[PDB]
Amino acid sequence: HIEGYECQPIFLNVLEAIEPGVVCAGHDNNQPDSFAALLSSLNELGERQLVHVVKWAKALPGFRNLHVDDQMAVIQYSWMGLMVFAMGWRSFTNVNSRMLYFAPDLVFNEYRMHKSRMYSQCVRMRHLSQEFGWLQITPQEFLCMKALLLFSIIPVDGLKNQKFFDELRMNYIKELDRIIACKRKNPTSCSRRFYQLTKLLDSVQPIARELHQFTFDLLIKSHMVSVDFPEMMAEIISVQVPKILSGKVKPIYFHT
């Protein structure tokens, strides 16, 4: 309800004041691009990205009021969706939607996209990226959206305390609405802009859903293709991820 003349910047300050910094993967580009070194690097990046998201999430407003197991759960799910989005925001402001900027030391160009044995999905991620430009997504809009994503995937069975969750997911959708509603007063373009982002958000689920199948399978024929897996990485992919596949855990789409 940002009305009057002041108040409300509070929320928008958090996301900004708590947005993780830069993250390196540890991939020496000065080496022949092989499916091994590549995927093995992205895997190392994933772990390195997880920790930040963890700290990042515990800083979120009202996030702490969530149950532990839940917090651990939720984070263990939408993690994929988030990273893809963040990475999308990186490739945009940086390589101006043309290359998959995963990390300073890891820039996915056409060639690598192929050698990664996953050129298909890469396109989708390079799509969601180009979208930021078209929809003219603003930083505030992103920082806010990325958060919402966190609470955008739960088991149809229900968390260990649904109420708190819904409440927060609720309060967050408003902030998104509160940010969108800060440029002019008219309940027209708002119902329009909101519709846009919401779509964008849901369009993330598919990719995630896709990037999941790939990593899981990769975990199976892991040793074969000789690709290392971080202690924490393999964990989620073998338990948490499978649930998303087994259908026990499902995303939360605004539309249909």
Binding site: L50, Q71, M232, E235, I236
Partner: peptide, 9 residues
């Protein structure tokens, strides 16, 4: 999980 719940604290 096990190795992650630690970071939550």
């Amino acid at each position: 999980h096990k190795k992650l719940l630690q970071l939550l604290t």
